[PDB]
Design a protein around this ligand. Sequence first.
Ligand SMILES: Cc1cccc([C@@H]2NC(=O)c3c(Cl)cccc3N2)c1
Ligand SMILES: [Zn+2]
Ligand SMILES: [Zn+2]
Length: 116
Amino acid sequence: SMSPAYLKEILEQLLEAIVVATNPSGRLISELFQKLPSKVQYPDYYAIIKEPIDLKTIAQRIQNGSYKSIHAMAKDIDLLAKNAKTYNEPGSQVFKDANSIKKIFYMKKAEIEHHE
Ligand SMILES: Cc1cccc([C@@H]2NC(=O)c3c(Cl)cccc3N2)c1
Ligand SMILES: [Zn+2]
Ligand SMILES: [Zn+2]
């Protein structure tokens, strides 16, 4: 039974792993996922994506204590990737970066949860 304070530290470590991850070229794969697109300049996004989310919102939820489990933030990471893979075309760099973010999150989650 983790305390809220313990859980927060785990969630912060998971988010940290996402936001420091770089491609082989050195670019932060999280760059384009920090902030949702403008409703004014990208109105189609909000017609297509039913539950928009970004990394700033996930970070806010960590700070708010909105997540009561690692699973809950995992599901928000899944949603982040699913939205990018719905809106942006397959083979787009945003599409691949979305899968990479998921890949990094679950690898770090396993490292944390299984280390002994
Ligand atoms: C118009 C356009 C062009 C290039 C990239 C995006 C990108 N697509 C996302 O789905 C996304 C997610 Cl999930 C979270 C935060 C910002 C995002 N914008 C949007
Ligand atoms: Zn396990
Ligand atoms: Zn250990």
